[PDB]
Structures are given as C-alpha cells and as structure tokens.
Design a protein around this ligand. Structure first.
Ligand SMILES: O=C1NCCCCCNc2ccn3ncc(c3n2)-c2cccc1c2
Ligand code: NA
Length: 329
C-alpha cells in the first residue's frame, strides 16, 4: 500500500551524517552516506494544506514530472546513441510519512547559522505529513560556491563545453529544457580522467576535463517529452518567477517567457542557450581564477569565451552550439 516511515529512508546512522547542502521553495537538500557511499537527498512536502516557503504544497500527481525527468536524465549515462554523464544518477524515490526528524532540523539550523536560509524552519509538519524523498548520486559542489576556487579560464571552457554537450544530448534524446540552470545547479566534482566522453545521435566525442566532471541538477522547472507525451512545470500563472531583479538570472526567466509566449508545454531549446549565456556571463564576470590569463595561450581562451558570449544568443539550441560554435572546434 502506502507511505513508509522516515526511518525507512533515513535510519539513525544515515540521519546522523546528514548535512544540509541546499534549498529552494520545494524544500531541502541534504548530503549523507548510504552504504559507505555519499548521496544527496531532496525532500519535498506533498499533499498538506500548510504554506511551505510561500507556496502551497504539490500533490503527488504534481511531483511526478520531476520524478519522471530525474529518471530519464539519470538513464542517459547508460544509453548508447545519446549518452551523457552530465546530469546526475537517481538512486531511489520514496513517499514517506512523519514529522520532520529532529536530526534533520539540527542540520537545517547549522546551515541557517552559517549560510542563512530563505526557508521556513520545517518544524511545523505533523506526524501524518507526506513527503517525497529523492535520493541522488552525490555530484560534488556547486559552481557558485566554487566561484573563487577554479584553476583558470581553461577550466571555465571545460565547464561550458560539458554543460553544452549534456544539454545537447538531452535535447536530441528527450527534447529537454532545464529551464532553471543558475550557477547553484551546476556541480563540480574532481575526476582523474583527462577526457570525458559523450555520444550525440550516434557520434561519439570527447571533452578535456581539466580535472572536473560537471553534473547538472534540480529539475523542478524542467521539461521533456517522450513519444509525444510532454512532461513539464506549467509556470504560466506564476507572477513572482518573472519579477526578480539584481542578477541576470532573473532576466532569463522573462526571456524564456518571451521566447515561448508563455506556453510552457512547447519545446523551445533556445531556453538552454539562454541559460548557457547566463553561465558564460558568470564565468567572465563573477569568477576569480587561481591562475590569471596572463599568458598568450590563456588570453586566447579568454577571447574565445568572450566571442562565445557575444555570439551564442544567435544559436537555436545547445545542439546548434555544440555542433557549430567555433568555441568547441
Ligand atoms: O534539486 C536539487 N538541488 C537544489 C538545491 C541546490 C543544492 C546544490 N548542491 C548539491 C550538491 C551535491 N549534489 N549532488 C546531487 C545533488 C546535489 N546538490 C542534487 C541532485 C538532484 C537535485 C538536486 C540536487
Ligand atoms: Na553527472
């Protein structure tokens, strides 16, 4: 039948090792260890009548899109014709019932103390409350938190290339749009591989890693389709999403709406190009590299990224960028 107790997904040892790693209107994301293996746990309240972080809770039906999308993107690491590891593994999904575990509140508190939270402390849920718990592969640390930690603009180039490739592969296989690819949703993890591999419509290629593997996460707003069945988040009646300021990020939401005429069911892979532009913009303006571009070779990489910034909005998809933009030649 129905939901399982929190303790089914989060036994004592696993709860004791939880550290909060991020948040959103949806809820909370923690890192922990499951079977000696780091994982990320995303916890979303469903079906209740309380306001949570300023919104009503989703119904089970309303969470299925994100579950579906998470599974599809996870599957791309093991496909053949259109293959990428540039999203994240989905290990499990559960529906749990209970009040919020005190140990997760303790982790929540530590995060609020050190980084600050925009969320309601999740301590008001009763013992009949339902949640969806998604357990993901642990993908490393977000680009925003790594903004002063990267080696050089060659590393930035790798990151852009990886992101563009991953998005292209998902466009080709799934008519995917991420739709919220701010720099908090780009993860970086060390790899000893010198080259990373992807396959796009049957053609395989490689990207120099610069020692990092990128994972694109958080599919709250994402869209895709399969066999003409579209799965998406309909934000056509959201006001607040389109009225932010203070960062180019908030312009991207408005520019998406302009591109799609507020019809979020449609496929508009230009949204992927918009997010990639926003990300290039962050690379050129808000990162501090450990090695400056004061050699001719590194200056040259900078000029290519500036050229990418200046021209990429004339491309129609991540696929168009990957296949045709001079940056990737
Ligand atoms: O919805 C998700 N994230 C939204 C909040 C940002 C947390 C960003 N930081 C990290 C750090 C490491 N990891 N590893 C996996 C994930 C993850 N997230 C992850 C996976 C799927 C969704 C989200 C997050
Ligand atoms: Na990944």
């Amino acid at each position: 039948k129905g939901p399982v107790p929190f303790s089914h997904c989060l036994p004592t040892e696993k709860l004791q090792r939880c550290e909060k790693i991020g948040e959103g209107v949806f809820g909370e994301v923690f890192q922990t260890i499951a079977d000696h293996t780091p994982v990320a746990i995303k916890i979303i309240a469903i079906e209740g009548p309380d306001l949570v972080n300023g919104s009503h809770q989703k119904t089970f039906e309303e969470i299925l899109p994100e579950i579906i999308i998470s599974k599809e993107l996870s599957l791309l690491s093991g496909e053949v014709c259109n293959r990428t590891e540039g999203f994240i593994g989905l290990n499990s999904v559960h529906c749990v019932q209970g009040s919020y575990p005190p140990l997760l509140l303790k982790a929540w508190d530590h995060y609020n103390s050190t980084k600050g939270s925009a969320n309601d402390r999740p301590d008001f849920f009763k013992d009949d409350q339902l949640f969806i718990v998604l357990e993901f592969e642990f993908g490393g640390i977000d680009l925003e938190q790594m903004r002063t930690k990267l080696s050089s603009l060659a590393t930035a180039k790798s990151i852009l290339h990886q992101l563009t490739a991953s998005l292209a592969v998902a466009e080709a296989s799934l008519r995917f749009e991420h739709r919220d690819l701010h720099w908090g949703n780009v993860l970086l993890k060390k790899t000893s591989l010198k080259k990373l591999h992807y396959t796009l419509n049957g053609k395989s290629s490689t990207i120099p890693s610069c020692g990092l593997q990128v994972s694109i996460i958080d599919y709250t707003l994402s869209r895709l389709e399969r066999d003409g069945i579209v799965v998406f988040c309909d934000v056509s009646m959201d006001e607040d999403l389109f009225t932010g300021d203070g960062d180019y990020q908030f312009d991207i939401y408005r520019l998406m709406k302009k591109e799609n005429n507020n019809r979020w069911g449609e496929y508009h892979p230009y949204s992927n190009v918009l997010w990639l532009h926003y990300l290039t913009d962050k690379m050129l303006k808000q990162m501090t590299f450990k090695t400056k571009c004061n050699t001719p070779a590194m200056k040259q990489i900078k000029r290519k990224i500036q050229e990418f910034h200046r021209t990429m909005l004339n491309f129609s998809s991540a696929t168009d960028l990957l296949c045709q933009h001079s940056l990737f030649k």
